[PDB]
Amino acid sequence: SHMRILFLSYRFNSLSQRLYCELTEREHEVSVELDVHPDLTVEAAELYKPDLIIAPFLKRKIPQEVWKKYKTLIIHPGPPGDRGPNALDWAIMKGERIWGVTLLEASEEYDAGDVWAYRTFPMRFARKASIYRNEVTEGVVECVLEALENFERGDFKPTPQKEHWWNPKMEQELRRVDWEQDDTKTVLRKVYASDSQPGASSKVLGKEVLLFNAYPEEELKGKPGEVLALRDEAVCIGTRDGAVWITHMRERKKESIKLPSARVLGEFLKGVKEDPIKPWEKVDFKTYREILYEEEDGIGFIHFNFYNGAMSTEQCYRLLETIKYAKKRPVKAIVLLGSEDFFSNGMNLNTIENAESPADESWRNINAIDDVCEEILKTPDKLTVAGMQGNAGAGGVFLALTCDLVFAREGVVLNPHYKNIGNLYGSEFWTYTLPKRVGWEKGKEVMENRMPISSKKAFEIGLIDGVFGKTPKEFRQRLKERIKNFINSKDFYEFIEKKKKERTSGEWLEEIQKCREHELEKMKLNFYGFDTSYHIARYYFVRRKP
Ligand SMILES: CC(C)(COP(=O)(O)OP(=O)(O)OC[C@H]1O[C@@H](n2cnc3c(N)ncnc32)[C@H](O)[C@@H]1OP(=O)(O)O)[C@@H](O)C(=O)NCCC(=O)NCCS
């Protein structure tokens, strides 16, 4: 009932972090060992002497020395019998209607071990990373729990594979987007199967690129392969039967990084003109809406779909513009929803890494996100709510915390700390926000913890205000119901009374200004001072090896 569990992962990735939260918070010890070398793996296992080894995320054989001596269970993102290193990629390229996940034993043949548990699910037409983070992750969690229960019994015998098949590593030629030959559906299937790695190769404006994060376009039309418009740095490209938006691209070179399309395409883009759509406009056709504002039951909902939850300096100002709009509206509550897969991961480290001066662009980014946080804070006459449908890390968590109420879906993983990015001091009014919820001592413990915590755990420690919902859709409905109830009550007006008296106080208003200028002073030293931890850690996060 207190098992010692060793994780063998290539990287401590989203699924590995979620499993670590699920097991740790059920009182098991989990040691995490990143795949460096087979000799080092046998070493780490021999010291730790686990009762059970889980491989949430592997790129290569586990040494037979380890799994013939410790029970080793492998995660595989395919249904029983599916073998190979790109299971999801193939499932999407082939158009599988039904898919699944398999927890199988380690064996001498790749993925040929007996099955300990599996789940199946219906497949959405969506990015590989979104399938992985939702259906695959929730399914994996169920298999691992059912496997830990069967391990306790010891009277469990796994099921050998029957029908099986092999899919090899998928080559670039198969993902290559050809605009004259590929319809919109085919472009989306190729980009979906390659998002977020390795990307679909293509040529745009005569430049060889990798495509990322596609969206169908039903109004704009033109010459296939012709760039039709810009819109918040995304480009819309003619296909064989219509058009598609591509928000992010990467030059096909060693040192190049994923960036918004306009930054990759650059001066190659001069003829093209913007085609704006404000978030509050209503639209009858499918197009790409980075930020979306809709009103339901006297409630203002701000969706913001920032790729990978990274918030560029410019995306912060686009968001602030929408919060200012929402604040002049006949609405009683304003709810920041983020996206389904991410609430926010703070500053965009890719646009920072790309800038002429990363220190300068860091200065811009932190002041832009602080401007968003200050605007939320300065809402005396409305209720402010953060709805975390997906994961959040670093500054993105503390953005959420400036809202009056913070809710999250079950299974959301949070990293409210800067231990991965050179120990930035942090801003986003955390010195005002965090103590008001957990106290200066526990808040420091939280920011000192480099391991993840669940949405469940954050509820306990008072970090957030409630956790519910299994899916993003479910969580959204629940959140709308709960907020509609509250503003349709007398409590809402008694809540606002206090908020109005305190928030328009010159005491409070200058208290938060001291906090901002305090955090920004610390962050300025991180950005510009002798210790360069931040820039070293950014370089490796942004350019990590796949
Ligand atoms: C939060 C975090 C621990 C989540 O870990 P994880 O579950 O393993 O998620 P990943 O690192 O795989 O994120 C997936 C993608 O989002 C990107 N991403 C996540 N946060 C990002 C950020 N702030 N800026 C730029 N890119 C980011 C990642 O590079 C990765 O890119 P890819 O899939 O295209 O290869 C981790 O992503 C992180 O530390 N992000 C940076 C947060 C930060 O330091 N912001 C600056 C201070 S506000």
Numbering used by the authors: -1 to 544
Task: Provide text from the study.
The putative catalytic residues, His74, Asp80, and Asp109 in the N-terminal domain and Ty416 and Glu426 in the C-terminal domain, are perfectly conserved among HypX homologs listed in the previous report. CoA is constitutively bound in HypX, which will act as the prosthetic group for CO biosynthesis through the formation and the decarbonylation of formyl-CoA. CO produced by HypX is used as a ligand of the iron in the NiFe(CN)2(CO) center of NiFe hydrogenases.
We obtained diffraction-quality crystals of HypX with two different space groups (C2221 and P41212 for Forms I and II, respectively) under crystallization conditions as described in Methods. Their crystal structures were determined at a resolution of 1.80 and 2.40 Å for Forms I and II, respectively. The Form I and Form II crystals contain two molecules (chains A and B) and one molecule of HypX in their asymmetric units, respectively. The unidentified electron density was observed inside the cavity both in the Forms I and II crystals, indicating some molecule is present there.
